[PDB]
């Protein structure tokens, strides 16, 4: 596999996109730290990856706490000796409300996880990668890092910020054997989204020129590509996996 | 004056861009609340505006504190009866350091002021605007809302987030007689740039195809246009005043 | 007016946006060369301009012919002595078809008028402006200079090209007292729209967060801004007048 | 092999990026049609591909001639039965001059190859892919599909149009089992660049945060990814391989 001998960290890897990323990375021979705030989801993920022949180990962390993220990376190096690859994926949707109605605490919660937690990841990841000869970071953005999601101004702002942070890191670290890029998924099938009224699901689908929602594995293939040597001249970029959503 | 009997609020209005915007608004007949964290600067601006034939009043605020921002909009309505226009301009540059070395506190501070404070302003501005038949908001972003500034990853992130927030507000309030746009200046000549050496100044200048830095008045002109009825079909947009910087 | 004694050229100024731009420029004191492929429309526009106190002259030109555009600019200099401002507005929409079905001749025709004609304009405009101390160009793009219009691939491709051209010119001429920017209108009201049933108007309206189409005068207001000294530090940029269309 | 039994067309495949794409496609099991205007280069690429163990054939074509492009696709179908993948790569750099000094012929020649040839390619490719249950197209753009290249306005304009064409095709064909994306390389090592002086090469390198030029293989890996089923939820997008160039 293309990540043989590499150590990879994934945040929010207990479900959806993060899990699919943890699976891809393990399937290509990485030793994967599965991180999540939820221990049940985290352990199930490690057992499923072990079951299918991979090396994974679970480390609990809330990305909005910088001490827990520093401790995650520290533990990664304890369990596996190094850090080569990180996907900063943990995120929340947040309250839905018009910006003028948007809660103060709800705003801060979304920004602390979706932005600050990504920044904390990057910071301790970069610190480690400089000790072990470099590495590659993938930041999970969204189509909402470039276009609005009405009623989700916090999410949008946080995802835009992630894009900007990615550009900064890719530029700053270009000659330091570190790459950093962002991925921008549109709407992706998860159990939550199957709950919607058929007409609401069809309204969302009609925003994607491909005429369906994405699958977590389709995001994960892009993440894998940007985390491997195949993307060796790619850095500071934002990469859509959007079904055409932003083309119109 | 194209803003006759409008009431305008400007944050960080004591110096630089904010001061020029406050002047331009007053020159066009607006009643202006000059807000700044610094009372001497703010009071000085109000006198200068009044000396030139305009109407203005000073209200102290730290935009990172949501209570102070709510109080500012309140006080605007107490003094002039309504809020028609707002320019969310207060910001800081922040620590300059590699993202891996960037301070946790320095990161929070830049994001607090440059993003949360803009959000707080927009939140309380929108709330009032819906009570007085709508209005117009201009958010001060930067070229760094779309391109990196090496060593200023917090600043970049925050300004990207401002561009996102703007798109969201413009999208959400499209049918509510409220417009919201963002301005992206490049580097602007202010007395605070006479602590650059000759070589550091020429280096900044060489990044602008126009071969000079911008003036605060030239940024204010764009703010003015975006705040008036002349820009009636412009909302959610990002508008460069960059001397060519981002064309290459 | 703000354009007092400037000499301004507008292509395709017999109808819609160009007409509004020609009115705006003339209302603000410019000497306006009205150009169009239709003599009746053109002369009609010049007479209409003069009826409100304006100075204008008609000059026929087909912008797909470089010789005609070069002679258009010679003729402008003959009539008014110089060229200060040019708006390259002349366009067509082309046939509606899937890219795979798109006519070879229709592709050619759209690119020839909407791109080559803009290039011709800029080439011969720049030549003359370097003889007379500089000046300002505005190129008419569209939202479809940055997002797709399904079934109108030629139009989209040409307007994308116009944005790229504009960046090049802004950057190339930044120290030669020449500015060049591009305007991106969304969908605009035309005479025909009033004739349609409710459902046919509302079709486009729903893609604009502002809940209406734009008026040609609202586009001309941004073109005027970008044509005057008010925008003196703006060059190489793309400027939306889109009602929020591209924010989502 | 990830393209096993797929039929892949590459234009301008005699050298540089196109040659690397053809090698990558063939290595992954595709039956490759190498197209080039130069027979000697084309035949040599086929021999080199066959020598590694791949399947390929040469079809001569000038992409600026739409009949030749039609015939190229017809011939691909005669040789290998179908068309699944196409990479529209043939391009030229064109004359270097200020926009106001740019030759009329040079402009047309650059646009004819860089844009029109890409459209002709997509036209006849889409026409065939609709007969054989779909396919995937990659259009070669450049960093200059989004940022200017002073003295190369025709190139910039044409690559911008490619980006727009791509968005259109991805949007239009989304539910028709056809994907279309564009690739945006920065400066890539070629014999030409290699020769150009130590001082100029350094100046160009220093515009890339990664501190080197790209290799054609590095571009090809992104093309391969975008042509494979791994990118199944990616369409209408623009994908950088720029070493960080556009991040600042």
Residues B108, A102: C-beta atoms closer than 8 Å? no
Q: How far apart are CA B232 and CA B238, in angstroms?
A: 15
Please, are residues A99 and B127 in contact by the beta-carbon 8 Å criterion? no
Distance from CA of A165 to the nearest CA of D (A): 10
Catalytic machinery residues of B = 155
* Residue position matching structure tokens 């026929």: C60
Ordered structural domains, chain B, with CATH: 1-248 (3.40.50.720)
Nearest CA in chain A to D207: A171
Residues A244, D210: C-beta atoms closer than 8 Å? no
Q: How far apart are CA A168 and CA A180, in angstroms?
A: 9
Please, are residues D147 and D187 in contact by the beta-carbon 8 Å criterion? no
Is D247 touching B (CB cutoff 8 A)?
yes
Q: Looking at A25, A80, A124, A155, which residue is catalytic?
A: A155
Q: Residue D88, annotated ligand binder? A: no
Q: How far apart are CA C66 and CA C73, in angstroms?
A: 11
Which residue in C175, C214, C239 is closest to B210 by CB distance? Answer: C175
Nearest CA in chain C to B187: C233
Give one DSSP letter per residue of chain D, joined into a string: -TTTT-EEEESSTTSHHHHHHHHHHHHTT-EEEEEES-HHHHHHHHHHHHHHT-EEEEEE--TTSHHHHHHHHHHHHHHHS---EEEE----------GGG--HHHHHHHHIIIIIHHHHHHHHHHHHHTTTT-EEEEEE--GGGTS--TT-HHHHHHHHHHHHHHHHHHHHTTTTTEEEEEEEE--B--HHHHHS-HHHHHHHHTTSTTSSPBPHHHHHHHHHHHHSGGGTT--S-EEEESTTGGG-
Which candidate in B172, B214, B234, B239 is best for mutational testing of the C interface (most C CBs within 10 A)? Answer: B234
Distance from CA of A172 to the nearest CA of C (A): 25
Nearest CA in chain A to D222: A231
Which residue in D130, D148, D157 is closest to C171 by CB distance? Answer: D148
Q: What is the resolution of this structure in A?
A: 1.9
Q: How far apart are CA B213 and CA B194, in angstroms?
A: 13
Q: Residue A101, annotated ligand binder? A: no
- What contacts C170, CB < 8 A, 6 or more positions away? B209, B244, B247, C179, C180, C181, C235, C236, C237, D148
Q: Looking at C25, C120, C124, C155, which residue is catalytic?
A: C155
Is A155 catalytic? The answer is yes
What letter would DSSP give residue A37?
Answer: S
Helices B117-131/B153-172 angle, 10° precision: 20
Q: How far apart are CA C87 and CA C17, in angstroms?
A: 10
Q: Residue A155, annotated ligand binder? A: yes
- In B, which residues are within 8 Å of D245 by CB distance? none
Q: How far apart are CA D181 and CA D91, in angstroms?
A: 17
* Positive/negative CA dihedral, C87, C93, C99, C100: negative
- In A, which residues are within 8 Å of D248 by CB distance? 167, 171
Q: Which residues 140-159 in chain B show a CB within 8 A of chain D?
A: 147-150
Annotated binding-site ranges of C for NAD(+): 15, 17, 36, 62-63, 89, 155, 159, 188
Which residue in D123, D144, D164 is closest to C157 by CB distance? Answer: D164
Structure solved using which method?
A: X-ray
Q: Is B134 left (phi over 0), alpha (psi -120 to 50) or beta?
A: left
Nearest CA in chain D to C121: D100
Which residue in B175, B208, B246 is closest to C211 by CB distance? Answer: B175
Please, are residues A151 and A159 in contact by the beta-carbon 8 Å criterion? no
Please, are residues C8 and C86 in contact by the beta-carbon 8 Å criterion? yes
Distance from CA of D110 to the nearest CA of C (A): 12
How many Cα atoms are found within 13 Å in the side-chain-facing hemisphere of A219? 29
Q: How far apart are CA A165 and CA A89, in angstroms?
A: 14
Which residue in D130, D145, D165 is closest to C153 by CB distance? Answer: D165
Q: How far apart are CA D66 and CA D74, in angstroms?
A: 12
């Amino acid at each position: 596999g293309i990540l043989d001998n590499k150590v990879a960290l994934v945040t929010g890897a207990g479900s959806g996109i993060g899990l699919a990323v943890a699976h891809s990375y393990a399937k290509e021979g990485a030793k994967v730290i599965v991180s999540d705030i939820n221990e049940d989801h985290g352990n199930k993920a490690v057992e499923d990856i072990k079951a299918q022949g991979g090396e994974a180990s679970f480390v609990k962390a809330d990305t909005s706490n910088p001490e827990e993220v520093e401790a995650l990376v520290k533990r990664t190096v304890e369990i596996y000796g190094r850090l080569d690859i990180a996907c900063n994926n943990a995120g929340i949707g947040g309250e839905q409300a018009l910006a003028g109605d948007y809660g103060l605490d709800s705003w801060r919660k979304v920004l602390s996880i979706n932005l600050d937690g990504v920044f904390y990841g990057c910071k301790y990841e970069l610190e480690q990668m400089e000790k072990n000869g470099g590495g590659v970071i993938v930041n999970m953005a969204s189509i909402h890092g470039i276009v609005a999601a009405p009623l989700s101004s916090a999410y949008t702002s946080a995802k835009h910020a992630v894009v900007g942070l990615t550009k900064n890191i890719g530029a700053e670290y270009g000659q330091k054997n570190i790459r950093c890029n962002a991925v921008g998924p549109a709407y992706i099938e998860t159990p939550l989204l199957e709950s919607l009224t058929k007409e609401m699901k069809e309204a969302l689908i009609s925003k994607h020129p491909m005429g369906r929602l994405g699958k977590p594995e389709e995001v994960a293939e892009l993440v894998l590509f940007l985390s491997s040597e195949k993307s060796s001249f790619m850095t500071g970029g934002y990469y859509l996996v959007d079904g055409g959503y932003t083309a119109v």
